[PDB]
A paper describes a structure:
In its native tetrameric conformation, TTR transports retinol-binding protein and thyroxine (T4) in the blood and cerebrospinal fluid. Amyloid aggregation of TTR occurs by dissociation of tetrameric TTR into monomers; these partially unfold into amyloidogenic intermediates and self-associate into soluble oligomers and amyloid aggregates. Here we identify two segments of TTR that drive protein aggregation by self-association and formation of steric zipper spines of amyloid fibrils.
To pinpoint which of the eight segments drives aggregation within full-length TTR, we created individual proline substitutions within each segment. We chose the substitution to proline because it is known to inhibit fibril formation. None of the proline variants fully halted TTR aggregation, but substitutions S85P, E92P, and V94P and the S85P/E92P double substitution significantly decreased protein aggregation and altered aggregate morphology. These data suggest that the 91AEVVFT96 segment and the N-terminally adjacent region of full-length TTR are important for fibril formation. We speculate that the S85P substitution, near strand F, constrains this flexibility to prevent aggregation. Substitutions in strand F, E92P and V94P, most likely hinder self-recognition and further aggregation.
Numbering used by the authors:
A (entry chain A), B (entry chain B), C (entry chain B), D (entry chain A): 10 to 124
The structure:
C-alpha cells in the first residue's frame, strides 16, 4: 500500500465515509491522466489504490470530492473538490498518506511520509 | 495594538461575530490571572485588548469562547473553548495576532508575530 | 475588490510574502483558462486581481504557488502548489477572500464570502 | 480504549513521535486534576490512556506538549502546549479520538467521535 488517503469531517466529528477520491498522474503531454480511484470506507480511509510496481516517481494529483460528500449530508459546501498535487520521490522506502480534514468552507491536508 | 484576535467560521464561511475572548496571564504563584477580554466585531476581529505598557513579558492564555458562539447559532459543539497558550515579549515587544478558524468538532489556530 | 487572497506561513508565524498566485476560470470546452494572477505583498495579501465587471459567474481555480515559496526559503516542500477550486457568483456577486496557511508538508485553506 | 490521541507533524510530514500528552478532569472545586498521561508512539498515536470504567462524563482537558516536541527537533515553537477542552457525553456507545496537526506557529485539532 504505497499510497493511502484518510479523510475526516470537522462538522460531525467523524470519519468522512463514502468520499470519492480520484488520483491522476501527469502525462508527457502535461495533462492529467486517471491513475487510481475509490471511495473512503467506514473509517474514512481508502486503501489499495495502487501497488509499489505502478506507483513510480512522477507528479500526482489526489482529488477529494468534497462537494459530493457535503451534498450527500445536505450541508452547503464551498469548494468543488480538494486537489492535492505533489511529486512522488523515491528517497529510500516510502509510504504516502494524504490526510484531509473537511469543513464546508475550509479544509486542510497533510502528507504523512513514512519509512 | 500589540495583541489582536481574529476568528473565522468554517461552516458559514464568514467572520465569527460576537465571540467572547478572555486573556489571562500566568502569575508568580503559577495561577492564571485575568488580563483582558472582549468580543469580536462584525469583521471577526478583536482590537484594543491591551496596550504596549500593560502587555509585558509573560505566559498568556487567549481563551476563545467557542461553545457560546456555536450555542448562539443553535449548533451543539464539542469543545468548551479554544485556549491558546504562549510566551509573549520574551525577546522584546512584538505585535501578536492570534487567528482561529472554527467548526463544531474542530478548530485551527495560528499566530502571526511581527516586529 | 471581489476576489482577495491572503497567505500565512505556519513555520515562521508570518505573512507569506511574494507568493505567486494564478487564477483560472473553467471555459465552455471544460479547460482551465488564465484569468488573473499576482504576488502577495508584505502583508501576505494579494489585492486587485480582478474587477466586479470581469469576475463573472463560473468555476474558478486559485492556484497558490507554494513550491516556489518554500524553495525561495531553502526548504524542500511536498506539494507542487495549492489549488483552490470553487464556483463563484452563482447567486449574484459576492466578495471572496481565499486564505491559506502553509507548512512544508501541509496547508489549510478557507473561504470568507461576504455580501 | 474510549479515549485515544493521534498527533501529526506538518513540517516533517510524519507522525509526531514521543509527544507528551497529559489528560486532566475538572474536579468539584473547578480545578484541573491529573487523569491520565503518556507519550505518542512511532505511529503518532497514544493508546491505553483510560478504561470505560474510569472515563465517566465530565469536563476533560487533553494537553499536547507541543513546545517540548519542537524543542526536541531543534525547531523554534510558538505555543507552550495545545490544550483541548471538552465535555465527555454518554450518548450511546462512543470512542473519542483527539487528533492534532502541529506546526511551529499553528495547530489544528479535531475530535473524531464514533460508535
Ligand atoms: Na496503496
Ligand atoms: Na491590543
Ligand atoms: Na479583486
Ligand atoms: Na483508552
Amino acid at each position: 500500500c504505497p499510497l493511502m488517503v484518510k479523510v475526516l469531517d470537522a462538522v460531525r466529528g467523524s470519519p468522512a465515509i463514502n468520499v470519492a477520491v480520484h488520483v491522476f498522474r501527469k502525462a508527457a503531454d502535461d495533462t492529467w491522466e486517471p491513475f487510481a480511484s475509490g471511495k473512503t470506507s467506514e473509517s474514512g480511509e481508502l486503501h489499495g489504490l495502487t501497488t509499489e510496481e505502478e506507483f513510480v516517481e512522477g507528479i500526482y494529483k489526489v482529488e477529494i470530492d468534497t462537494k459530493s460528500y457535503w451534498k450527500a449530508l445536505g450541508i452547503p459546501p464551498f469548494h468543488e473538490h480538494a486537489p492535492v498535487v505533489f511529486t512522488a520521490n523515491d528517497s529510500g522506502p516510502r509510504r504516502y498518506t494524504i490526510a484531509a480534514l473537511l469543513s464546508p468552507y475550509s479544509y486542510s491536508t497533510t502528507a504523512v511520509v513514512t519509512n
